[PDB]
Amino acid sequence: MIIREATVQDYEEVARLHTQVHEAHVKERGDIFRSNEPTLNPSRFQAAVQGEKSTVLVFVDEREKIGAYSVIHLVQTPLLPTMQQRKTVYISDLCVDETRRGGGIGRLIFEAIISYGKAHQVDAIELDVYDFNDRAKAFYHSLGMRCQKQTMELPLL
Amino acid sequence: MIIREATVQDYEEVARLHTQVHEAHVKERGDIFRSNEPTLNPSRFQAAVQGEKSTVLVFVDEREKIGAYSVIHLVQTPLLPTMQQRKTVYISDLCVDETRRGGGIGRLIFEAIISYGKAHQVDAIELDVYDFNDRAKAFYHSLGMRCQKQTMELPLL
Numbered sequence: 001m002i003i004r005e006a007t008v009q010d011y012e013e014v015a016r017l018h019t020q021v022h023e024a025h026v027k028e029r030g031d032i033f034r035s036n037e038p039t040l041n042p043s044r045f046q047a048a049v050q051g052e053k054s055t056v057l058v059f060v061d062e063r064e065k066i067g068a069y070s071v072i073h074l075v076q077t078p079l080l081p082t083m084q085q086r087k088t089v090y091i092s093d094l095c096v097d098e099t100r101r102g103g104g105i106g107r108l109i110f111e112a113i114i115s116y117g118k119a120h121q122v123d124a125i126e127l128d129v130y131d132f133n134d135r136a137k138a139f140y141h142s143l144g145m146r147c148q149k150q151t152m153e154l155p156l157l
Numbered sequence: 158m159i160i161r162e163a164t165v166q167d168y169e170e171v172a173r174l175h176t177q178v179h180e181a182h183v184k185e186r187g188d189i190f191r192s193n194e195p196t197l198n199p200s201r202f203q204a205a206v207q208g209e210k211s212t213v214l215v216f217v218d219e220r221e222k223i224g225a226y227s228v229i230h231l232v233q234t235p236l237l238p239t240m241q242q243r244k245t246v247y248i249s250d251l252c253v254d255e256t257r258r259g260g261g262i263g264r265l266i267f268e269a270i271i272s273y274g275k276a277h278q279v280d281a282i283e284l285d286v287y288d289f290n291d292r293a294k295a296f297y298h299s300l301g302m303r304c305q306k307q308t309m310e311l312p313l314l
């Protein structure tokens with residue numbers, strides 16, 4: 001059991017985790033999300049892994065299998081007249097293998113993100129979650145996260 | 158009373174209204190929002206007024222007095238393997254003068270925005286609102302709006 005930075009060789013396993021979460025979003029919001037195979041572009045994954053401001057973390061179990069992964073970004077907004085300069089870690093992905101959920105792995109990954117965040121003296125960790133996603137909302141709430149803002153919608157069709 | 162598109166000459170009044178709302182945000186989330194005079198850039202207002210994909214609407218009820226305004230944008234996202242192609246109206250601003258509230262003015266502006274969305278056959282109207290902003294949430298809820306997704310935060314500093 002370790003958390004390490006991902007390599008490009010982790011692609012297939014991470015891609016599989018991404019598709020679990022993506023298919024859940026297709027199911028609930030098919031007006032926004034579309035089914036595709038794969039759901040994670042291998043070149044885009046490689047870019048995240050090697051990116052200057054991005055980092056991919058994996059949780060690897062006792063049998064050297066990927067049980068979870070996350071993609072994070074160090075984000076800097078410039079000073080503006082009406083907005084504070086702000087440095088954040090943005091989590092664009094955090095997936096735990098569906099059959100390994102409810103057993104500590106997500107929290108372990110997130111603790112590593114916090115460690116990274118603090119070492120870079122960021123103001124906050126941020127992420128976006130779809131409103132239907134009760135499981136994610138409960139998880140992130142349990143970690144001390146709260147709503148900053150929300151996207152509201154009025155369908156017109 | 159009338160609703161019409163803004164002109165450049167509307168800047169000073171529209172700016173004053175923008176400032177009421179900006180200051181509210183500075184008050185409640187000074188970590189994100191910064192005080193400045195003005196809070197609305199005049200050139201950027203002009204661009205919104207004349208923009209190809211943007212529209213500025215004002216409610217006029219009194220001589221030399223704008224009671225409300227809104228800025229909206231026609232947004233189109235391309236077909237991707239994993240995301241549906243999407244056409245929306247995005248409301249970047251909608252302010253009703255603090256002293257003119259409680260008389261249906263916001264609703265009238267929003268109805269105009271709906272008509273715009275329909276005329277352009279958009280999938281939906283969208284906007285973002287900050288979590289502290291109970292007054293705006295109740296207003297948008299009352300007009301049929303629902304939460305699509307939310308930004309969550311964990312301050313580290």
